[PDB]
Write a protein that binds this ligand. Sequence first.
Ligand SMILES: CCN1CCN(C(=O)N[C@@H](C(=O)N[C@@H](C=O)[C@@H]2N[C@@H](C(=O)O)C(C)(C)S2)c2ccccc2)C(=O)C1=O
Length: 325
Amino acid sequence: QDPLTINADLQRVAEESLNAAVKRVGGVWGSAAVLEIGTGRLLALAPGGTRSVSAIYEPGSVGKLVTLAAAIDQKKVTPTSTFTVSSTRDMPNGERISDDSPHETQDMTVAGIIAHSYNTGTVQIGDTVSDSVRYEYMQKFGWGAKTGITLPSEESGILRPHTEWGDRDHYTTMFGQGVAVTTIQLAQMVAVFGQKGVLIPPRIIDGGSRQVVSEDTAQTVLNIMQGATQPGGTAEGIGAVKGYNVAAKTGTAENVGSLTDTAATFTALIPAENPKIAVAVVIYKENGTVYGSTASAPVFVDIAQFAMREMKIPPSTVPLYKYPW
Ligand SMILES: CCN1CCN(C(=O)N[C@@H](C(=O)N[C@@H](C=O)[C@@H]2N[C@@H](C(=O)O)C(C)(C)S2)c2ccccc2)C(=O)C1=O
């Protein structure tokens, strides 16, 4: 019978979690997409109108995975390459870049950088690759284009041609600012890292795809992503799905509305040793800041715990991956 892909129980979990989280956090709206890994099948899409597919927003530091992957794919960097992290850092082109909150400067590996999500580290990582190269990766990950799901009013996102980026744009697009995204785009993206560098176009209809990154870089981005829940990681505690290895990335971005809003974002893969779902969450607050971790992780967590039961996936048999930092 059922020609749609939605899992009704999973959908209800999503809507519930989502609704609660938006209330909890004083947001004005939210959205969540759960994609099955390997098939591109939508298991859940909240809030169930079309806003999930048509509301666009600057995603923030979830965009960091695009730049990380580019640098790695181009072999310009490795998990264990080391850079200096600082509360601010003045760049060649006259730009000052700042971390969320000041910290003692120190050297960190790439692994630890995006794990702590330090802009000052990632900006350096992005500088190892040309803007036209980054730009091309951004497009292959599906930014600035409709995913092509069969639901009305999909927005294409905003991805200005790199040849158009100023000194600020050079660096802001490195951590998902100066770019607009829909939640469906974000799920499709992270899905790549569980798909051996392949992007599968999402589907809501079953029935009386492209290579974005190498299989190897996908897997390394996958290992780095597991650093999110470990001590010091932005999703420590809050991102934990008891008994299951979680690869994830938070994001907390400013948006206009001028520049008074924020979008708390979360994109995760689970279970990390062998991903079965790709999850993307966003909660938008209007005159206030809201953190991907405090806001959106809990949603993923509720969804993720159910999905693992629902899909009769056994708990993780192997340790959460660690690179030294
Ligand atoms: C173009 C100017 N302009 C405006 C937008 N803006 C900005 O909002 N910066 C944010 C940012 O994007 N940094 C995060 C990326 O999300 C890093 N990752 C977060 C995470 O994942 O939790 C983090 C660990 C909380 S900080 C930020 C800073 C402080 C608090 C929350 C978010 C800039 O500063 C910036 O350049």
